Amino acid sequence: EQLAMKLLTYELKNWSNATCLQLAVAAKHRDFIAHTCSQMLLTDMWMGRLRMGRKIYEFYNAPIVKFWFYTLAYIGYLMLFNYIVLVKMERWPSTQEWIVISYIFTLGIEKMREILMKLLQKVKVWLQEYWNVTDLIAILLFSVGMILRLQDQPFRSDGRVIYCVNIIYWYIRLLDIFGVNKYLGPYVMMIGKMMIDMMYFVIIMLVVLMSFGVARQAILFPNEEPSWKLAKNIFYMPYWMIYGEVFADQIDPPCGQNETREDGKTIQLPPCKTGAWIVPAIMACYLLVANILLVNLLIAVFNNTFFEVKSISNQVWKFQRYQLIMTFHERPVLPPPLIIFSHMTMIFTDDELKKVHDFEEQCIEEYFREKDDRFNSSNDERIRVTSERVENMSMRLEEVNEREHSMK
């Protein structure tokens, strides 16, 4: 194991001082990293020196503790955001809102510093990831909301709603934090892959939904001037019909009849419509098509695709682990709220190599010899050799026997 560890990483003057792991990652082999030895080395680097004066420097620069500090800071910021949105706000912001906006803008500054490290290549690589794009969009929306909040009464309520709708993205961004976990990262990738089948189901569900809604709306309300309520009514009830609310009251009202009512004066009933029973019939057919067929088909699709997706997701996560570890290795010690000071600071043997080479040469020779021996041990090789010798021997023996007649 020690020889393999030494061979894995050591600066090469021949290849611009690049270790084997860096080449493998850049090559995107996707199998050299996943090997157990590489994972062990990655874990050892993840735990840094503490593989359980100088303590202050080594302990607080280990990636794991920095990751935990960032997570705790994010959780606290999320708690403050929740408290702010739930509680009423006066004309001027409180201390919590100042802390929140400072966090947001420090995060933006950190993103700018990271991208700054041609510029077009850097931008393309940065856009390769989607989390950064979503974070930038959310930060811009938050800035718009903050600007709107401070400008008098009529605009402040709009900024508040902007905050309320924005908090959802930060709530959902905890999946990135969960990505580190061994048993929980693949779940997110599986969900992301199943979203496509979700969309394909959604299209047909929408078609059927619209057909039923238009039919119901047209059969009833025969006379009605144009307006936008029709579009809302097309979608309203049928969508909720999927999740167990069928509106039993409105399925088929009695309509016209002579009803004396109870505990009140008799109320004359309306005159009904030309056709209504068609509405219950179509409702029954639509519910049968939707709540049973398509959902179970989606279940079958998920069952079929789960096994195929699982192993690929696991391998991909094992590969991304290296970039995660290095990213947390390069980051500053302090979390986003307090790294403004960090930004201010930033702006301001041969015998061993011979032994490793000899070990590698011995391994190469042994591997090639083993491969040759295994190939020779194949029954096909033995069968081919046996047939060839037998054929040659039989012909030689026949000639000797025929020639032996002259001796006789």
Ligand X SMILES: CCCCCCCCCCCC(=O)OC[C@H](COP(=O)([O-])O)OC(=O)CCCCCCCCCCC
Ligand Y SMILES: CCCCCCCC/C=C\CCCCCCCC(=O)O[C@H](COC(=O)CCCCCCCCCCCCCCC)COP(=O)([O-])OCC[N+](C)(C)C
The binding site consists of: 182-183
Q: Which is nearer to ligand 6OU, 198 or 338 (CB)?
A: 198
Distances from the Cα of 380 to the Cα of 23, 369, 376, 387, 390, angstroms: 39, 19, 9, 11, 15
Least distance to a second copy, CB of residue 211, Å: 4
Q: Which is nearer to ligand Y01, 133 or 198 (CB)?
A: 198
219 interface partner picked from ligand X, a second copy, ligand 6OU, none, CB below 5 to 8 A per type? a second copy
**Interface with a second copy (CB under 8 A), residue from 17, 43, 82, 311:** 82
Q: Which is nearer to ligand 6OU, 7 or 219 (CB)?
A: 219
CA distance 213 to 224: 16
Q: Which is nearer to ligand 6OU, 21 or 175 (CB)?
A: 175
Least distance to a second copy, CB of residue 311, Å: 12
Q: Which stretch binds ligand Y (CB under 6 A): 23-31, 202-210, 271-279, 284-292?
A: 271-279
CA distance 65 to 46: 10
Least distance to a second copy, CB of residue 376, Å: 11
Q: Which is nearer to ligand Y, 36 or 274 (CB)?
A: 274
79 interface partner picked from ligand Y01, a second copy, ligand Y, none, CB below 5 to 8 A per type? ligand Y01
56 interface partner picked from a second copy, ligand Y, ligand X, none, CB below 5 to 8 A per type? none
CA distance 1 to 23: 21
Cβ atoms of 131 and 137 within 8 Å: the answer is no
**Interface with a second copy (CB under 8 A), residue from 32, 69, 70, 239:** 239
Cβ atoms of 102 and 337 within 8 Å: the answer is yes
Burial readout 120-143 (b: 16 or more C-beta within 10 A, e: otherwise): eeeeeeeeeeeeeeebeebbeebe
Give me the 208-247 binding string for ligand X, x by CB under 6 A, dash otherwise: --------------------xx-xx---------------
- Within residues 128-157, the interface with ligand Y by CB under 6 A covers none
**CA terminus-to-terminus distance, the chain:** 72
Distances from the Cα of 245 to the Cα of 60, 248, 249, 315, angstroms: 55, 8, 11, 43
- Within residues 154-173, the interface with ligand 6OU by CB under 6 A covers 168-169, 172
Q: Positive or negative CA dihedral for 277, 279, 280, 285?
A: positive
With DSSP H G I counted as helix, E B as strand and the rest as coil, what are the percentages for the chain, rounded to 5?
75, 0, 25
129 interface partner picked from ligand Y, ligand 6OU, ligand Y01, none, CB below 5 to 8 A per type? ligand 6OU
Q: Which stretch binds a second copy (CB under 8 A): 118-126, 179-187, 318-326, 364-372?
A: 179-187
Least distance to a second copy, CB of residue 385, Å: 6
Q: Which stretch binds ligand Y (CB under 6 A): 78-86, 272-280, 285-293, 395-403?
A: 272-280
Cβ atoms of 126 and 134 within 8 Å: the answer is no
Distances from the Cα of 399 to the Cα of 31, 385, 391, angstroms: 59, 22, 13
- What's 338's DSSP letter? G
- Within residues 201-240, the interface with ligand 6OU by CB under 6 A covers 208, 211-212
- Within residues 253-292, the interface with ligand 6OU by CB under 6 A covers 278, 281-282, 285-286, 289
Distances from the Cα of 146 to the Cα of 103, 107, 142, 169, 294, angstroms: 13, 16, 6, 17, 44
CA distance 96 to 111: 23
Beta strand segments in 262-308, E: none
**Interface with a second copy (CB under 8 A), residue from 47, 191, 363, 364:** 191
- What's 34's DSSP letter? T
CA distance 316 to 321: 9
196 binding ligand X? (CB under 6 A): no
Amino acid at 353: L
Q: Which is nearer to ligand Y01, 75 or 390 (CB)?
A: 75
- Within residues 243-262, the interface with a second copy by CB under 8 A covers 243-248, 251
- Contact positions toward ligand 6OU, by CB under 6 A? 129-131, 134, 137-138, 168-169, 172, 175, 188-189, 191-192, 208, 211-212, 278, 281-282, 285-286, 289
